[PDB]
Amino acid sequence: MRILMLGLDAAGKTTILYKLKLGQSVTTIPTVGFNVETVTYKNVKFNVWDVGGQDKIRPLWRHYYTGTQGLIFVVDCADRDRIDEARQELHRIINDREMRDAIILIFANKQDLPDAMKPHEIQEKLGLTRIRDRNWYVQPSCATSGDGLYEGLTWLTSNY
Amino acid sequence: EMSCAEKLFKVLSFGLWNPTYSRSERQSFQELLTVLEPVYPLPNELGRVSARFSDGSSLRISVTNSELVEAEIRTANNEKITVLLESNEQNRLLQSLPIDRHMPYIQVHRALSEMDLTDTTSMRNLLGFTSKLSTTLIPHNAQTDPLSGPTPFSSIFMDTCRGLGNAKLSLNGVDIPANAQKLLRDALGLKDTHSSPTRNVIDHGISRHDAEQIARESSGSDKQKAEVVEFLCHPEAATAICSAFYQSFNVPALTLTHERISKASEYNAERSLDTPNACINISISQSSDGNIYVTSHTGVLIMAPEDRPNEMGMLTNRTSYEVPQGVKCIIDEMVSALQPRYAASETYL
Ligand SMILES: Nc1nc2c(ncn2[C@@H]2O[C@H](COP(=O)(O)OP(=O)(O)OP(=O)(O)O)[C@@H](O)[C@H]2O)c(=O)[nH]1
Ligand SMILES: [Mg+2]
């Protein structure tokens, strides 16, 4: 099961990548190119693809779509100023013919934060609510703790 | 039966962490690891290190851009030993050298057995081990590049005057101690409130005189004391010494970590412990071509990620650059000449 993690920069994708790859949270750096690493979980070897989410290098992810089976969209639930800038990237992502049919984990990551946006509001504020013909599950997480992540795996695994 | 240089490399090779040593062993390893020093690397190398021991053995390690390791040892009895090898996963000879690496996250070390972070002195000693260890590059950023900002080096001579007396400081491998350090502070004209050095120190470096005293009062070998003297007597010396104490070199790394830094800082004030902010550790080298190379480390306390509550460690910021031969200790010139590389480490217990 080849996985592709997508999201805006500074969402915590890379952090989740190594929270899961190393088991312990590390201090990440602006991902310039990409990372990829493999994670066996419950006899299942995810193959996750981390690509820089900076405004700049956004349209290079399509170079990655062909193969994906689950769109982990990882979210910074404190940054509300690009909440729209990101409710859109989501629609563009799965609309592109590449990702027509694919289960969709949503990491409401950065919940430990004060102004932590609730998991349901995430569902709402992304536009996830009025959409069907589609597996889309919302997963509250803290990437630096580990919260949610291995429950989100459960969904990827389970629902596939 | 072995020279210090052979012992270190063997230890470095086996595993500087492999949990077996008898403390008496570790303690004597840290000792050896202290003389190891980053020097100017070739454009095709990750970095290069060099050491001169009190038994006349000498250790040089190159690491090529493709993490390929080349070692040279010269013994007590004029033996020449070349070693080829790759650091892998078990050894990680690479983690155990003061070199910068390209990685998605800040390299995490562990400390040796009974190392603590409990006081000012246990801190300089953690830095004493972290400053010989590997770091991860933080890619250049106009926003955090302290040389990018509007006040570049503004605090240079205050940090210098302040850090002098209270740093680990190495000139071409020779340890400059606290008094020699204050002596070098005076030699620059910097015990002063907040003046700049003499127009003499600039342009002429230090005087032969001050230079001799300084090296005289410093720890190491005579031949090495002579390099110190000759290095001091150029202006690039001042440039290199002063810029090395520059406090904002840490900005990129603090940019990444500031909240777990704040936590570490808060976390100590609740206890009533009084350990300082930064611990400073500096290595300067002039190779025979007269090239000058600086590696400056600042260690600062920092909390582990939330998944490891109540665990404190050290964040080791390395800043490295050559001081091209022609650059005197004035702002505009150092702003345009120096091209600091920034890299950081996190070390825990
Ligand atoms: N408070 C909080 N911060 C987080 C969380 N997850 C990640 N971060 C931080 O947010 C910053 C961005 O995390 P990264 O994983 O590097 O961001 P990215 O998504 O990989 O962005 P790019 O590297 O540019 O592609 C990092 O400093 C993380 O430590 C979280 O759950 N809570
Ligand atoms: Mg990233």
The residue whose two tokens read 């070897």 is: A45
- Residue A146 phi/psi, 5-degree rounding, is 125, -5
Cα–ligand 1 centroid distance for A16 (angstroms): 8
List b or e across B252-285, with b for residues whose CB sees 16 or more CB atoms inside 10 angstroms.
bbbebbeebbebbeebbeeeeeeeeebbbbbbbb
- Using CA positions, which residue lies closest to atom 30 of ligand 1? A110
Cα–ligand 1 centroid distance for A15 (angstroms): 6
Task: Give me the CATH topology for the region B1-94.
Answer: Nuclear Transport Factor 2; Chain: A, (3.10.450)
A144 touches chain B (CB under 8 A): yes
Handedness of CA B151, B157, B158, B163 (dihedral sign): positive
Angle between helices A149-158 and A13-21 (to 10 degrees): 80
Give the one of A29, A32, A144 whose C-beta lies nearest to B105's C-beta.
A29
Residue A144: CB within 6 Å of ligand 1? yes
Q: How far is CA B264 from the centre of its chain?
A: 23
Resolution (A): 2.5
The C-alpha angle with vertex B296 and arms to B42 and B184, in degrees rounded to 5, equals 115
Q: Going by DSSP bridges, is the β-strand pair A71-76/A2-7 parallel, antiparallel, or unpaired?
A: parallel
- Residue B140 phi/psi, 5-degree rounding, is -45, 140
Residues near ion ligand 2 (CB < 5 Å) are A 14, 31
Could you tell me the residue ranges of all domains in chain B?
A: 1-94, 95-349
Interface of B with A in 271-310 (CB under 8 A): 305-308
Alpha carbons A9 and A93: distance in angstroms, whole number: 15
Give the one of A14, A19, A27 whose C-beta lies nearest to B346's C-beta.
A27
Alpha carbons B205 and B190: distance in angstroms, whole number: 14
- H-assigned helices in A27-118: 62-65, 83-95
Kindly report the CATH number assigned to the domain that includes residue A130: 3.40.50.300
A13 touches chain B (CB under 8 A): no
Q: Judge whether A116 is annotated as a binding position.
A: no
What is the maximal distance between C-alpha atoms in chain A?
A: 39
Is there a contact between B244 and B294 (Cβ–Cβ < 8 Å)?
Answer: yes
- Residues of chain B contacting residue A146, judged by C-beta atoms under 8 Å apart: 307
Q: Which residues contact B228 (CB under 8 A, 6 or more apart)?
A: B171, B172, B174, B176, B211, B214, B215, B218, B220
Please state, in angstroms and as integers, the Cα–Cα distance from residue B200 to each residue in A24, A37, B5, B232, following that order.
Answer: 54, 57, 40, 13
Alpha carbons within 13 A on the beta-carbon side of B173: 24
- Burial of residue B10, with CB atoms counted within 10 A of its CB: 0-12 exposed, 13-18 middle, 19 or more buried: exposed
Q: Which residues contact B167 (CB under 8 A, 6 or more apart)?
A: B181, B245, B280, B281, B282
Q: Judge whether A77 is annotated as a binding position.
A: no
Question: Which SS3 state, helix, strand or coil, does residue B187 take?
Answer: helix
Question: Which SS3 state, helix, strand or coil, does residue B337 take?
Answer: helix
Q: Is the CB of A25 less than 8 angstroms away from the CB of B308? A: yes
Chain B residue with CA closest to A15: the answer is B105
Which among A97, A100, A87, A86 is positioned nearest to A9, based on CA atoms?
A: A86
User: Which atom of ligand 1 lies at the shortest distance from residue A53's CA?
Assistant: 25
Alpha carbons B98 and A125: distance in angstroms, whole number: 47
State how far residue A21 is from chain B, nearest Cα, in angstroms. 12
- H-assigned helices in chain B: 4-14, 24-33, 120-130, 156-163, 178-188, 201-204, 208-216, 222-232, 235-244, 251-255, 258-269, 331-337
Interface of A with B in 52-111 (CB under 8 A): none
Q: Is the CB of B106 less than 8 angstroms away from the CB of A26? A: yes
Domain boundaries, position A118: 2-160
Residue A143: CB within 6 Å of ligand 1? yes
Alpha carbons B117 and A52: distance in angstroms, whole number: 36
Residue A145: CB within 6 Å of ligand 1? no
Give the one of B105, B141, B306 whose C-beta lies nearest to A28's C-beta.
B105
The one-letter amino acid at A138: V
User: Which atom of ligand 1 lies at the shortest distance from residue A142's CA?
Assistant: 31
Question: Which SS3 state, helix, strand or coil, does residue B339 take?
Answer: coil
> Which of A17, A21, A29, A50 would you mutate first to test chain B, the one with the most B CBs within 10 A?
A29
Which residues are bridge partners to B173 per DSSP?
none
- Residues of chain A contacting residue B101, judged by C-beta atoms under 8 Å apart: none
Which among A5, A152, A12, A136 is positioned nearest to A79, based on CA atoms?
A: A12
Q: What is the DSSP letter of B105?
A: B
Task: State the total domains in chain A.
Answer: 1
Which among B153, B106, B146, B157 is positioned nearest to B317, based on CA atoms?
A: B106
The residue whose two tokens read 């300082």 is: B276
User: Which atom of ligand 1 lies at the shortest distance from residue A147's CA?
Assistant: 31
State the catalytic residues of A: 54
Alpha carbons A25 and B70: distance in angstroms, whole number: 33
Helices (H) and strands (E) in chain B, counts: 12, 14
> Which of A17, A19, A27 would you mutate first to test chain B, the one with the most B CBs within 10 A?
A27
Residue A129: CB within 6 Å of ligand 1? no
A 10 A CB-CB count for A145 gives: 17
The C-alpha angle with vertex B92 and arms to B296 and A37, in degrees rounded to 5, equals 100
Alpha carbons B257 and B312: distance in angstroms, whole number: 13
State how far residue A113 is from chain B, nearest Cα, in angstroms. 12
Which among B335, B279, B324, B12 is positioned nearest to B130, based on CA atoms?
A: B279
Which among B97, B93, B132 is positioned nearest to B13, based on CA atoms?
A: B93
Q: How was it solved?
A: X-ray
B258 touches chain A (CB under 8 A): no
Alpha carbons B182 and B132: distance in angstroms, whole number: 25
Residue A148: CB within 6 Å of ligand 1? no
Cα–ligand 2 centroid distance for B38 (angstroms): 30
User: Which atom of ligand 1 lies at the shortest distance from residue B305's CA?
Assistant: 29
Q: What is the DSSP letter of A15?
A: H
